[PDB]
Structure formats: C-alpha cells, structure tokens
Design a protein around this motif. Structure first.
Motif, PDB file in Angstrom:
ATOM      1  N   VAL A 169       0.841  -1.191   0.000  1.00  0.00           N
ATOM      2  CA  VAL A 169       0.000   0.000   0.000  1.00  0.00           C
ATOM      3  C   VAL A 169       0.875   1.240   0.000  1.00  0.00           C
ATOM      4  O   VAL A 169       1.840   1.346   0.757  1.00  0.00           O
ATOM      5  CB  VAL A 169      -1.019   0.006   1.146  1.00  0.00           C
ATOM      6  CG1 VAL A 169      -1.279   1.433   1.615  1.00  0.00           C
ATOM      7  CG2 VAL A 169      -2.325  -0.642   0.693  1.00  0.00           C
ATOM      8  N   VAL A 170       0.543   2.155  -0.895  1.00  0.00           N
ATOM      9  CA  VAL A 170       1.303   3.379  -1.096  1.00  0.00           C
ATOM     10  C   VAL A 170       0.519   4.574  -0.594  1.00  0.00           C
ATOM     11  O   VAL A 170      -0.610   4.812  -1.040  1.00  0.00           O
ATOM     12  CB  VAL A 170       1.608   3.556  -2.601  1.00  0.00           C
ATOM     13  CG1 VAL A 170       2.678   4.627  -2.830  1.00  0.00           C
ATOM     14  CG2 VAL A 170       1.983   2.202  -3.234  1.00  0.00           C
ATOM     15  N   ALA A 171       1.148   5.356   0.278  1.00  0.00           N
ATOM     16  CA  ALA A 171       0.525   6.551   0.862  1.00  0.00           C
ATOM     17  C   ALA A 171       1.253   7.847   0.539  1.00  0.00           C
ATOM     18  O   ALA A 171       2.378   8.055   0.973  1.00  0.00           O
ATOM     19  CB  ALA A 171       0.425   6.403   2.366  1.00  0.00           C
ATOM     20  N   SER A 172       0.579   8.758  -0.148  1.00  0.00           N
ATOM     21  CA  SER A 172       1.179  10.055  -0.460  1.00  0.00           C
ATOM     22  C   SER A 172       1.531  10.804   0.834  1.00  0.00           C
ATOM     23  O   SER A 172       0.738  10.874   1.769  1.00  0.00           O
ATOM     24  CB  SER A 172       0.211  10.883  -1.317  1.00  0.00           C
ATOM     25  OG  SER A 172       0.559  12.255  -1.321  1.00  0.00           O
ATOM     26  N   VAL A 173       2.737  11.348   0.888  1.00  0.00           N
ATOM     27  CA  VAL A 173       3.194  12.099   2.052  1.00  0.00           C
ATOM     28  C   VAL A 173       2.230  13.254   2.317  1.00  0.00           C
ATOM     29  O   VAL A 173       1.912  13.561   3.470  1.00  0.00           O
ATOM     30  CB  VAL A 173       4.651  12.585   1.845  1.00  0.00           C
ATOM     31  CG1 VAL A 173       4.869  13.961   2.450  1.00  0.00           C
ATOM     32  CG2 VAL A 173       5.637  11.581   2.416  1.00  0.00           C
ATOM     33  N   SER A 174       1.724  13.847   1.240  1.00  0.00           N
ATOM     34  CA  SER A 174       0.786  14.956   1.325  1.00  0.00           C
ATOM     35  C   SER A 174      -0.609  14.554   1.823  1.00  0.00           C
ATOM     36  O   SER A 174      -1.336  15.373   2.401  1.00  0.00           O
ATOM     37  CB  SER A 174       0.671  15.654  -0.029  1.00  0.00           C
ATOM     38  OG  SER A 174      -0.632  16.190  -0.202  1.00  0.00           O
TER      39      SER A 174
ATOM     40  N   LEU B 145      -1.132  12.025   3.993  1.00  0.00           N
ATOM     41  CA  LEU B 145      -0.980  11.725   5.416  1.00  0.00           C
ATOM     42  C   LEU B 145      -0.918  13.015   6.248  1.00  0.00           C
ATOM     43  O   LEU B 145      -1.507  13.100   7.309  1.00  0.00           O
ATOM     44  CB  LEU B 145       0.303  10.916   5.665  1.00  0.00           C
ATOM     45  CG  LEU B 145       0.379   9.442   5.250  1.00  0.00           C
ATOM     46  CD1 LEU B 145       1.785   8.869   5.415  1.00  0.00           C
ATOM     47  CD2 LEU B 145      -0.655   8.583   5.991  1.00  0.00           C
ATOM     48  N   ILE B 146      -0.181  14.008   5.771  1.00  0.00           N
ATOM     49  CA  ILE B 146      -0.001  15.257   6.503  1.00  0.00           C
ATOM     50  C   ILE B 146      -1.183  16.245   6.434  1.00  0.00           C
ATOM     51  O   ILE B 146      -1.780  16.585   7.454  1.00  0.00           O
ATOM     52  CB  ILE B 146       1.302  15.969   6.069  1.00  0.00           C
ATOM     53  CG1 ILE B 146       2.519  15.070   6.232  1.00  0.00           C
ATOM     54  CG2 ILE B 146       1.499  17.257   6.833  1.00  0.00           C
ATOM     55  CD1 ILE B 146       3.773  15.676   5.603  1.00  0.00           C
TER      56      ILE B 146
ATOM     57  N   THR C 203       4.251  10.148  10.068  1.00  0.00           N
ATOM     58  CA  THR C 203       5.023  10.844   9.042  1.00  0.00           C
ATOM     59  C   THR C 203       4.876  12.371   9.149  1.00  0.00           C
ATOM     60  O   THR C 203       3.781  12.927   9.076  1.00  0.00           O
ATOM     61  CB  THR C 203       4.660  10.338   7.655  1.00  0.00           C
ATOM     62  OG1 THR C 203       5.214   9.032   7.492  1.00  0.00           O
ATOM     63  CG2 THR C 203       5.219  11.269   6.576  1.00  0.00           C
ATOM     64  N   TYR C 204       5.993  13.053   9.323  1.00  0.00           N
ATOM     65  CA  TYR C 204       5.936  14.490   9.468  1.00  0.00           C
ATOM     66  C   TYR C 204       6.680  15.219   8.364  1.00  0.00           C
ATOM     67  O   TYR C 204       6.886  16.426   8.433  1.00  0.00           O
ATOM     68  CB  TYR C 204       6.438  14.891  10.838  1.00  0.00           C
ATOM     69  CG  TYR C 204       7.921  14.696  11.036  1.00  0.00           C
ATOM     70  CD1 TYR C 204       8.458  13.433  11.304  1.00  0.00           C
ATOM     71  CD2 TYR C 204       8.786  15.782  11.000  1.00  0.00           C
ATOM     72  CE1 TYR C 204       9.808  13.266  11.542  1.00  0.00           C
ATOM     73  CE2 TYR C 204      10.136  15.632  11.281  1.00  0.00           C
ATOM     74  CZ  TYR C 204      10.650  14.373  11.547  1.00  0.00           C
ATOM     75  OH  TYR C 204      12.011  14.234  11.780  1.00  0.00           O
ATOM     76  N   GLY C 205       7.031  14.494   7.315  1.00  0.00           N
ATOM     77  CA  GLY C 205       7.703  15.115   6.193  1.00  0.00           C
ATOM     78  C   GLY C 205       8.187  14.158   5.124  1.00  0.00           C
ATOM     79  O   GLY C 205       7.898  12.962   5.155  1.00  0.00           O
ATOM     80  N   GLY C 206       8.936  14.694   4.171  1.00  0.00           N
ATOM     81  CA  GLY C 206       9.480  13.896   3.089  1.00  0.00           C
ATOM     82  C   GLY C 206       9.284  14.494   1.709  1.00  0.00           C
ATOM     83  O   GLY C 206       8.800  15.624   1.553  1.00  0.00           O
ATOM     84  N   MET C 207       9.658  13.714   0.702  1.00  0.00           N
ATOM     85  CA  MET C 207       9.547  14.123  -0.685  1.00  0.00           C
ATOM     86  C   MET C 207       8.140  13.877  -1.230  1.00  0.00           C
ATOM     87  O   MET C 207       7.500  12.879  -0.887  1.00  0.00           O
ATOM     88  CB  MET C 207      10.557  13.334  -1.517  1.00  0.00           C
ATOM     89  CG  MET C 207      11.999  13.764  -1.315  1.00  0.00           C
ATOM     90  SD  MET C 207      12.674  14.529  -2.803  1.00  0.00           S
ATOM     91  CE  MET C 207      11.404  15.769  -3.163  1.00  0.00           C
TER      92      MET C 207
ATOM     93  N   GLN D 239       8.356  10.709  -2.961  1.00  0.00           N
ATOM     94  CA  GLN D 239       8.894   9.619  -2.140  1.00  0.00           C
ATOM     95  C   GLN D 239       7.909   9.233  -1.025  1.00  0.00           C
ATOM     96  O   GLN D 239       8.226   9.333   0.173  1.00  0.00           O
ATOM     97  CB  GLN D 239      10.257  10.002  -1.550  1.00  0.00           C
ATOM     98  CG  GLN D 239      11.454   9.421  -2.311  1.00  0.00           C
ATOM     99  CD  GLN D 239      12.090   8.233  -1.602  1.00  0.00           C
ATOM    100  OE1 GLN D 239      12.176   7.137  -2.158  1.00  0.00           O
ATOM    101  NE2 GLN D 239      12.562   8.455  -0.376  1.00  0.00           N
ATOM    102  N   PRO D 240       6.698   8.789  -1.414  1.00  0.00           N
ATOM    103  CA  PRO D 240       5.558   8.384  -0.588  1.00  0.00           C
ATOM    104  C   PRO D 240       5.948   7.325   0.419  1.00  0.00           C
ATOM    105  O   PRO D 240       7.062   6.796   0.373  1.00  0.00           O
ATOM    106  CB  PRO D 240       4.611   7.769  -1.611  1.00  0.00           C
ATOM    107  CG  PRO D 240       5.519   7.160  -2.615  1.00  0.00           C
ATOM    108  CD  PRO D 240       6.782   7.986  -2.646  1.00  0.00           C
ATOM    109  N   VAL D 241       5.030   7.020   1.333  1.00  0.00           N
ATOM    110  CA  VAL D 241       5.268   5.971   2.318  1.00  0.00           C
ATOM    111  C   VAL D 241       4.705   4.662   1.777  1.00  0.00           C
ATOM    112  O   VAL D 241       3.665   4.652   1.105  1.00  0.00           O
ATOM    113  CB  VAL D 241       4.755   6.328   3.721  1.00  0.00           C
ATOM    114  CG1 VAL D 241       4.697   5.091   4.593  1.00  0.00           C
ATOM    115  CG2 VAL D 241       5.668   7.363   4.369  1.00  0.00           C
TER     116      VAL D 241
END
Lengths: 332, 332
Positions: free
Chosen positions: A252-257, A259-260, B243-247, B250-252
């Motif tokens: 499963v792939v989660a966009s950093v954006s 999640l935040i 998750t508090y950051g990243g690209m 570069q998703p989780v």
C-alpha cells in the motif's frame, strides 16, 4: 473412514495438499466429535498452505479454517452442545477440510441451524470481516458513505449488503473484466449505490463524480498499489483506509501529502486477531447479529459450488483463479 | 527602511525570493510592532515558496514562518504585550523574513526572555513537532523505546533530547554519509541510545538487533520509501508510524502483511493544524513545558549558521542542500 486434506510441506496447494485417512481420537472429557457439513476454500486457506500468513498451523496440517459441522457426540463434561447442533470454528487454524473430527469444545461455537447451510458454512469469515470493518474504524451513520475495492469478492459483496441494511452508501470499485456491465447490475441489486471501474476512478473525472453524495470517511482495501492509492484519494479529511487483503508484492502506497495535510489514516484488519482478542460470547453476538440480517433476507450467501472431498484438486485449482466465478465449497 | 524577503511567484527560492523594501502599517488598535531578531530557514518555508504546501500565503508573500522578535510598540488596546517583550508566531503563515513588521496581537505569543534568543528562534517549530509526536500518538512511559529516521535533522535532534528528558530509549536512523562516525558521537551525546545507518537497518541483522531492549510502539518518519518501510518493520504489533515530512515523489510504502498481521497504524502530523485545532493557552502550555527543558539544560539549541538578511541567497542555497551542516538562521 475418516478422510482429511493434509499438507506436510508449505507450497502451491495443488501440489502440497493430498487426501489422507486418519484415525479419530477419543471424546476425552471436554472434547467434541463433529461431522463436517461444508467447508469453503478461501484465500487465507491458500496463503496458509503456501506459508505466507500470520498464523501457520504446524506441519503436517489439515487445510481449511472455515466451515459448518454437526455435533455427533460430546465429552463427559460438555454443557453447551448437544448432538445435532451446528458448529463453526471459534478461531482460525482448526483444519476444516476433513469428513470428521474431535475438537475441544472451546475451539467451537454453535450457530443456528435454521439458516441455509451455505450461509452457515460461509458466515464465520467474509460477513464477519465485512461487519467488523464497518464498525471498528469509523463511526458511520445512515447517509454516510463507504468506498471499497474488490467489490465482487466475498467480503465486498457482504459489505454491500450489510452496508445497505445499515443505511449506508457504497461506492464500489470492481476490476476490469470482459463484461463489467454484467457485474454492475448484479451488485447494484445487492444494494450497491455505485459501481465503478479501477479505470473510471483513475481518470480526471473523479474529483467531481464524488460531488453530489458525501465523501467517505472509510475506505476498504484488498488490492493495493495504484488501486489503493486511488482509494486514499477519495477519502475525506481524516478518513481511514483499512487494508484487509492484497498481494505480498503489491504494498500500500501513501502520499506524504495525504498523510499530513488530509490527515488520512491507514490501518489493517485481521479477523483472527479480533477473534483472539475477544470473548467467544462476543463472537457469538456478532453471529447473532449476522443471522438476524439473514432471517430478514438482508444478507445472502454468494454463488456456491459444492464439491465432494474426493475432487478437491479441481476445486483447489478453481480457487487459485483471480476470476473465480463461484465459491468452492467442499462437502463430505 | 523596512526590508523583506518576498516572492511574487511560486518556485525555486533561490530564484523567486528577492529583497524588497516595504512600507510599515499603523499600529491601529490591536496591532503589534516588532523588530525581527532572528528567523530560521525551515523545510516548510521552502515547500511554501515552492508551492507544495498545505497552507500557502497569497502572493506576493513574505518568506518565513518561524522567528523571534522584540515588541517595539503596541496598539491602543493591547493587554498582554509591553514593548521590549520577546515574541514568536502563534501559527504559521506570518512572514518572518523581514526586518520589521506589524502583526495582530493574536498572531503572536510571548516567550520568556530568560531563554536564549538562539533557542527562542527555533522553539515554535521543531521542538513543538517533536514533543507533539511523542505525546499525541502512543502513550509512552519511561523505559519505552522510539524509532525515527533523519535523526540529525532539527526535529530528530529535538526528539533525542525530549525523548531523553522523558526517560525514553531512542533508536535513531541517520542517512549514509562520508563520516557517519562524527554524527553518531554527536547525537549519542544529545541522549541518543543507538545511532544507526539506513544501511545497517536494511541488513538481515535487525530481526535480532531489537532483541535485548523493547520494541518501539512509535516510529517517526521523515524520509519515506524503503527507509519508511524498514522503520515500519521495527514496530511492535499495534505500533504507529507517524510521518511528518518527506519528498512529494517519495511516498510511504506499507506492506500488506505488516498492516494486517501486525496491526500497524500510519498517521501524519502537521504542527500548523494542531495549532489551529487548539487554543492559544494550549500552545502556551506547550511553550512553557519546552522552556522548562531548556531552563534545566535538557533541551539545547541546534547548530546553526547566522547570516545577515543581506546574504539570504547564500543561506537559501545552503538549505536546499540534502547534507546541509547547520540550520541556516537569518539575522536582522
């Protein structure tokens, strides 16, 4: 004689699984003797045989985790079960693919026998998972929506009915198939409000399709990858996507954006865990709740194909298929 | 003259940001005048100028969201701030990269003047993010372990200290670099119990490295990709990875088996949202609690390079670098 489907090695079921005869034990006290009525063949059963699963019965194990059995006799001190009673396993790992067994009375739980056998044989897994996932993650109220993928699965289908009987609106994603139109009408008559393709979702016309009805706070995922990424995209700020299936190579792939800034949550669901974390009685109420919907025709078993234990290999093969038309049910 | 670092278009800071002279407003009523003392350059400032952020101030905007300032004069009805008072921003978006400004009184918060100005300039962001992530997801007791990546970042460093003052055990993952040995000794002296590489974590000797001490229920992610999946692997059943950051590319990545059989949770944390969802008093409590660690020397300012607002491009350049040695701080 006593015939059982057992695997001594972990591997591709059609190779690992073989039919064997077994001697029964003695009904030594708290033990219960059962005659298996019907045992489905599920993906968790396959994964177990393959060696890729959270719970792995020691080898050689008897295949199967779900099924209905009729009590034939009870141990010197059995209180809750009299012969003629219908039972299903209390937790996974039991080994249902066999004509007859002697089980500890606490590994079993009685089900009403006034329901279709086919329903009883498939009640302990798919409908329980569906129900729990609708309950345990987001508090849904009539009018609220739920988005899911693999909507034609045993679980998706059960989620559709349960959701409907719950006053909820489901938007269901189905895989692309030769006649996605045949499927649509089918689920729609199951209560499904919307049926869309993995395609129709990953187009640009999704940011707006979902405009008239309320966004879903709950997403149900069993696929992963890009399908899963798209489910996450349909979620409202703070929603939860619960993954309850998929491939070991399709993460499963989660966009950093997401999640935040959208504060989405990602969780998992494991029926065996819930069953082990809860009392037998608690599993019992859940069953009672599910029998309720059945009696009032709101929850119905799915396409069943009864196969004699004799021809398990054909059944086994038919279940390894991604486009398996009907649930393979071993009978004895 | 009132100098500011503003951007009229979104894009690469080193291109969009240019020094501009501005006309100061009038202390009309509840307004508050301030002379910027120092303003750090944070990743959220970069993402803001670039355009990839959950809160974007309307162009043309002044860069910066964090910094310390002294009150020069107050408006007709200002109750809590007297000139000579030290303040920081109450929430993000203010625009701190300038010599002088007039802000509404609510957009500000007094900081005790008995803390170092160096500390005060980085207190409203990183240390707040760290302390909140240690509190809002898992209930940690003394002796509990925590894992994070990018341990040498502003947040990571604050995590080490706060976690230490909290009696917790940290396992800190640092990126691979020419001399990861220098870094290690640094963090270790900040309180880090273990410092490990991205490399050392993805070997096989990890299923056992975490054998003596307790598994962490909390994982703190800033990288994503394979590093975020390896952090995921170290969690105890039921643990959360925040998750508090990243690209943005570069998703989780969450393994199906980890979400399901390990019941792992994946969340996000956005300080700006917590500050908006909470009261000023609640922000004040957080600030008092952090100022207490400082007072007792349990939380110290990180390494920095102070730079007159003049040479901002120099500092801007320095900070868009992945291996940036020190936090770039602007002075005015």
């Amino acid at each position: 004689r006593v015939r059982a489907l057992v695997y001594g090695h972990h591997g591709d079921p059609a190779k690992v699984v073989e039919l064997k005869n077994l001697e029964l034990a003695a009904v030594r006290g708290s033990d219960v003797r059962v005659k298996m009525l019907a045992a489905p063949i599920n993906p968790s059963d396959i994964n177990m045989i393959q060696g890729n699963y959270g719970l792995l019965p020691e080898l050689p194990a008897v295949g199967g985790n779900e099924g209905v059995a009729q009590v034939v006799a009870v141990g010197s001190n059995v209180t809750g079960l009299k012969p003629g009673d219908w039972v299903i396993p209390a937790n996974a790992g039991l080994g249902t693919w066999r004509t007859e067994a002697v089980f500890s009375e606490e590994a079993l739980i009685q089900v009403p026998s006034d329901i279709p056998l086919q329903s009883a044989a498939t009640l302990g897994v798919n409908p329980c998972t569906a129900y729990r996932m609708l309950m345990d993650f987001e508090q849904l109220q009539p009018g609220d929506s739920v988005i899911q993928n693999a909507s034609n699965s045993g679980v998706g289908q059960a989620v559709i009915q349960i959701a409907a009987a719950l006053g909820l609106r489901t938007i269901n994603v189905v895989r692309d198939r030769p006649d996605i139109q045949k499927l649509s009408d089918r689920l729609k008559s199951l209560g499904a409000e919307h049926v869309i393709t993995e395609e129709e979702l990953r187009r640009p016309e999704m940011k707006n399709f979902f405009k008239d009805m309320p966004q879903p706070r709950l997403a149900l995922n069993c696929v992963g990858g890009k399908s899963s990424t798209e489910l996450l995209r349909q979620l409202a700020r703070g929603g939860t996507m619960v993954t309850y299936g998929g491939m070991a190579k399709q993460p499963v792939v989660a966009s950093v954006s997401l999640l935040i800034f959208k504060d989405l949550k990602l969780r998992g669901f494991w029926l065996s865990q819930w069953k082990k974390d809860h009392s037998p009685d608690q599993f019992k109420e859940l069953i009672l709740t599910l029998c309720d919907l059945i009696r009032r025709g709101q929850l119905t078993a799915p396409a069943c194909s009864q196969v004699p234990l004799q021809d398990y290999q054909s059944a086994l093969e038919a279940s390894m298929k991604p486009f398996i038309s009907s649930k393979q049910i071993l009978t004895m």
